[PDB]
Amino acid sequence: MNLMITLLTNFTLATLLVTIAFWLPQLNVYSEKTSPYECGFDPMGSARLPFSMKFFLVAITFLLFDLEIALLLPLPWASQTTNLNTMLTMALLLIFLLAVSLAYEWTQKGLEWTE
Amino acid sequence: NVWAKEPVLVASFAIAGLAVILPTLSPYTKYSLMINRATPYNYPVPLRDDGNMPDVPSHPQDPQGPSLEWLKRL
Amino acid sequence: YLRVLFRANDVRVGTLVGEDKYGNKYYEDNKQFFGRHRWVIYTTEMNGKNTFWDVDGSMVPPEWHRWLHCMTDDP
Amino acid sequence: SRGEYVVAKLDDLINWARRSSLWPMTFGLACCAVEMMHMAAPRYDMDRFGVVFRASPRQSDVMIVAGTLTNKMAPALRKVYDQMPEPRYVVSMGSCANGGGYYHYSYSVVRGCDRIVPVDIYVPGCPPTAEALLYGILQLQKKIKREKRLRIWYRR
Amino acid sequence: MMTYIVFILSIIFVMGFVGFSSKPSPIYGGLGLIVSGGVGCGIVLNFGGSFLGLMVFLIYLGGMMVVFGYTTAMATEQYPEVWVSNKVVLGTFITGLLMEFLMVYYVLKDKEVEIVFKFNGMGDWVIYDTGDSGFFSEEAMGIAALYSYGTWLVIVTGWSLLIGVVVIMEITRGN
Amino acid sequence: TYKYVNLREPSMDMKSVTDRAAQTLLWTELIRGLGMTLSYLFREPATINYPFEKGPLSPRFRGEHALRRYPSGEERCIACKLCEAVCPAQAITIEAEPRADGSRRTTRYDIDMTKCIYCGFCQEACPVDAIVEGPNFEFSTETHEELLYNKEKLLNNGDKWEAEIAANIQADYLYR
Amino acid sequence: HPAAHGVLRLVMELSGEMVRKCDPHIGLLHRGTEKLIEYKTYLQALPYFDRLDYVSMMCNEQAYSLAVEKLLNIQPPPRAQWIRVLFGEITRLLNHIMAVTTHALDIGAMTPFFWMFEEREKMFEFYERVSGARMHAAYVRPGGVHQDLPLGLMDDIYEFSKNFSLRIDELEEMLTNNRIWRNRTVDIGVVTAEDALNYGFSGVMLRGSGIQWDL
Amino acid sequence: MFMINVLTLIIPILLAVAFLTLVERKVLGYMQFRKGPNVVGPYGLLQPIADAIKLFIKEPLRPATSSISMFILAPILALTLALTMWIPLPMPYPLINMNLGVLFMLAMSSLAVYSILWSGWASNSKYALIGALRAVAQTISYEVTLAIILLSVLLMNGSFTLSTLIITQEQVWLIFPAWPLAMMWFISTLAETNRAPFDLTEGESELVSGFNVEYAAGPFALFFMAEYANIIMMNIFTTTLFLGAFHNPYMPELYTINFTIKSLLLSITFLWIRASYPRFRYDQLMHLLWKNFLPLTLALCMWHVSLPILLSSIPPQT
Amino acid sequence: MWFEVLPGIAVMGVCLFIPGMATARIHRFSNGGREKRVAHYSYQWYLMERDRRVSGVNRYYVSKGLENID
């Protein structure tokens, strides 16, 4: 809870920056500043319109390679046991499987479209 | 030729291939196995008196049992 | 020195061409490039407006205005 | 007079903090924009005075209207102007902007930008020189030197 | 003063996670999910977990970033609703909150609650480790498995992930 | 004569391809770009400090729109209206009157500084060099009314300096 | 918008970060110059051809003065021809360096802007010393160049040409076979030379795409 | 006294950010053949202090449909998490002696990305949407490669504990057993730190500040300070993670001086890379990142797995 | 040259200096002069626990130096 103490002090610092932004300097005359600005002209609607995106495979690609990051990240505790053979073998097999999946979707233009 | 189709990629395949090949011919996997076997994390227990085992010695000062000396000795 | 240390930046007195009424000082050098030949130091309260701070352009008389915008070669 | 002395000190402080930077927006319609770009020259700096290009209008300190305002442009000009931090200043740069100039007649020209926004600091020229533009920014800073905001607020 | 701190962090987790699963707009749901994942990492960390909570914080949180990318890309309403906008959304959120406060009430002023099991009301410094002189640090050696003893398991897991990659590519390719 | 560019095949020598591969791996001419950035880093800047070190100009510079008068004499203008006839934005507004003695002079002399486009056509057309483009540039106004000038404003503006304008004309009279 | 060099309203009706259509709406900077020159005379309306293109301050003056001379059957003296060609190439240099500079600003490339605008400050000092103008020098009357150059110009043109050859070599050192500027902009903007003829393109477009054509 | 150590961590980062803004403007000026802020105050300094006051004054104010909770909670979590990154950093003895620090670094960096994300969604004017999805794409790219390169450089010597890492940095710096891995990681830190538009597509001139299109004039300071704390943050983490100095034993001042000098000259190198190169491209970022870094990183990871079995350099891992 | 950029870097580097020296001063101020006994594993924590047990004032850094032999 000492890092929670640090989080508490930074929360109090951030809220005092909010209050010193809002309440101290001057007045608050609204009613045209609140209008949505794009580049000089009043546009149609707003955001939250259906915004069809370019990449489809790339976010799922990130997700699955983050999952193999999750399986690979205990490498230092891999490196200290009496079974060196299975250690090095399954480590090489996991990275080689990662490279195999990458090589498949690299050769099958899974990244060469709307990137 | 086979080098510079994608050159950093082929260099990566080369260091990958030597990483595959090279621990087969390795004169130090046995040293890694010995050192990793000979770091006790827990207590080396005693045992019942013996049936006159002429091994597993009476005092760990006595070099009857499995000692290690090759740490300082390269 | 705090005069010129917080006037702007300079320490480059050493040519000493002259001054003019309103007291203002004019220094011409040849050792620097074309653009810092002729520089000017503004005095204090030349017409009671406390012109140590908030210095104005055209607090100079016009003959030094022609001299200092690099239109002539002699003061 | 400890109260009014503290008010004078703090008002002088905040006015100095106002007149320090004055980062504008790069509005720049016509060739007075090119003159602004040559006020961004090494031979005449603006970052000596904290005049820093900040393209988004919702944090710029002043607005340098430069270039020929037209009727097709003027709603975009004011709908940029009306959303800004609450202190706001207008530097009208150039004879097109500050009284029409050469196109003072001739339809789809607003006859100077006075008909759209409040305009504090005029710098006239076709173009204004960059030296004259920086002098206009200095005299804007002296207008900031004579605010007496919090003095008026306390003696109210 | 506090000694129920894992129960407290679990109450904050249940608040953020009921507001998560009450289904507002999914960006507000992801706000709730990042709050819930952060305090759940805090629960398992302050319980005695060394790294695995910060690990799942990282992994699960990058997954939520991908979920944000798709909920922005695909379909939103003309105006997205928040927790306190609708009849049903506000009703489910406040009644989940009411279930939370009601179980806090019927634990803190009672002995036990037996809705599905006899739940003992007192914080979990019991039962707990009586200071084992380990130095092997259980979670470190625990994830130092999957590699010494874990032969078949990483085989089928990585094979499932490779099949997952070719499956995603061929589902989008199936046009 | 034409000199057309970007025509090469990449030379497939072993030395060429290993130099280009080392360029790909080490980002070599990227480091050469960094070297150019340091080479301009270790210079000295050619700025001017603004109020104290003013930028240079030219003798034919066109600023203030002042007026000259005669050597130990009166107003050099006649109201001959050539400056209105050549003023392209029609900023010159002149309504003359002969004075109380009979010689032809003015009443209403107006240079609309909001409309002036700083050519020098009134400097060319002025047959006595009465109107002269001034040397300096500080109008810099907090109001709109103070931009538009009149006869007494321009003559006070011409009484603030004469030998300035006489020096620039004596430098420039052979050319124009 | 700062990448919109000047002003150009652009209604891009796109699919997300990879477009469908774009429409350049221009006319926001409309000033009525043709109607004004209809209600003016020649010499009084020459600054419209100063101010129309606001980069080629001498080239369009050359264009309009040669238009009046080709209408009027008058040859100017050859010294004015040489000085006008000199300033045509000088303002051509200023226009090419503004093109490189605004492409640098539209692509990133923050510092060569500053380098070559120090050089263009030297260019503006030359225009000041010649015509007495900052950036809109009339200086080209129909009927030859009026109000010619003083003693003290050709020296600066000589020394500035040597310095400028050094500086354009330094710009080729910094950019121009840089890695990622090149990988940013090669594979884009291809227009077929048949359609580069029949979209009415001219000048640098017909330079870069195909045909050999110089006026 | 723990509150006093909290104060001596939260106070110097503010002066660090403010005079880093000064050194940005002045180094950028002397780079670009001009001169920086020289007139105002002592040479520049009290003008960044005046910038803090000036941006405090500007009275922040909300857009139309911008829901206020998410709105004002985005940059607060930005600056809070940008502070709480600096908890385990071993300036000689850190604040919380964490048994694991670098995975904590990755976690709070992802949270900084979420802060940029929530501000870009809640500002709600379609340009903040554009810039937010550009940020999402460059974070799809840059949390794989940086994390796996991290795993490589901690595999040989680190084991997650930065005190044992400063034990390891005695004989040779870790720049020599991994220099190309270090170069790829420096590129990734320059991308993920979201400065130096060599690898940044958020503060372009093609957009207008997609992270801050219309947030509010007040918390622009918060978001600004968060990104420059990101710069100092990853440069200090680079300066610790690779190289440094065998410190004066039980004596802190020599180590602190040498560490500060190395870290700040590396930050000047970072700024000097910003002052040099053109901006970048979306599809070129995906192509360049994956198809140039990623198999080379996998090859470095497998060779740094095999090297503790090729040369018996397994760590003495506690 | 770089003759004028050095004061900004130097002031901002003293700004980076003060967390390290301040933190070291607070650590040595907090525990009787002793550099802080960092506790990685539960073995070290149990050793620190019996250390703060045998002190009497429930502060481990006294460390009761070679005098309860009797």
Ligand code: SF4
């Ligand atoms: S005043 Fe002159 S320089 Fe400025 S925009 Fe108008 S025509 Fe261009």
Ligand code: SF4
């Ligand atoms: S051209 Fe000269 S003399 Fe004639 S009216 Fe104008 S100012 Fe007077």
Ligand code: SF4
């Ligand atoms: S310089 Fe041109 S616009 Fe100005 S008053 Fe003279 S002729 Fe008219």
